[PDB]
Amino acid sequence: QPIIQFDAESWEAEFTQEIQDKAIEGLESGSVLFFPKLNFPLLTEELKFLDPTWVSGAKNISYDPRSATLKGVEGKSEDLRLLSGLLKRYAEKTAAFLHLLFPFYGSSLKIARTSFRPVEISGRATSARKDDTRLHVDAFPSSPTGGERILRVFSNINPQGKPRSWRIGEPFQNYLNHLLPQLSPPAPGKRFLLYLFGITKGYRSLYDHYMLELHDKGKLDLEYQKNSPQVAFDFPAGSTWIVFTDQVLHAVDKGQFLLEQTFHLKVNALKHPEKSPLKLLETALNKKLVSSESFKL
Ligand SMILES: CCCCCCCCO[C@@H]1O[C@H](CO)[C@@H](O)[C@H](O)[C@H]1O
Ligand SMILES: [Cl-]
Ligand SMILES: [Cl-]
Ligand SMILES: [Cl-]
Ligand SMILES: [Co+2]
């Protein structure tokens, strides 16, 4: 069941326990939670930001809600104030919604960076590694997770009714199994040098090493990209969806104007930790893949 649909229409909706159970079971099973009527409206004075010229450099426009800091865009203070207010409002609304929907996670949800993506996808072109028309789970070479989950909320805010076209692939366990013959341990000392030289933010755990290998090798596996099970779905303008993007194989084919919020969640806060990429990888390789793991018993 790759996509599970929900009726909630408001960022302040309250949920029955039955819907909460449907959401957490589906999320942790690697389904996309889809909210077709959950629109994120913009203020009239924000409509000018529906314009790709606001991206000033090679990075995405991003906002850190913890520090209230906006990056990746230049301009007058008043325009940066307005754009910060837009992304802050998305951080607030998505965080409130997740706390209404997932009480089981309690205060273990840790908000990370908000992003605004005004560039049309179908004109993009990058290296094969960075090409997100290729199915992948999320792993970022400069930003190891240490095993923590990457939970993302997406809202299509296209003002011309254009959908955002995704493809959703097969379960993580099958992807891992497909690529397992291709996995290899890191060269000794290499990750230590990446840390010492400032290439990585923190030390890249073995978990992060293997998630990057899965990400990169899966993108280079052209037969797998072509033939693996996958469904194409158009997320309509004015819809919202929620995904563990480190677990759900996904690719983005076209669309323009997206708000995105990243949260992190420790594995031991999950209802079924054994379903996490970390635990599936530790099982498949029979080893501890994050050295800072808490010790039980
Ligand atoms: C609409 C404004 C947002 C409301 C914030 C979510 C309210 C949280 O709701 C609470 O979450 C707790 C977990 O931390 C649970 O222990 C409680 O049972 C639950 O009532
Ligand atoms: Cl990176
Ligand atoms: Cl090392
Ligand atoms: Cl996307
Ligand atoms: Co991705």
From TrEMBL:
2-oxoglutarate binds at R117, R152, R164, W166. Keywords: Metal-binding. Succinate 2 binds at R164, W166. Fe(3+) binds at H136, D138, H250. Pfam families: Kdo_hydroxy. GO terms for molecular function: metal ion binding. The keyword Thylakoid does not apply. This is 3-deoxy-D-manno-oct-2-ulosonic acid (Kdo) hydroxylase. It comes from Methylacidiphilum infernorum (isolate V4). The lineage of its organism: Bacteria, Pseudomonadati, Verrucomicrobiota, Methylacidiphilae, Methylacidiphilales.
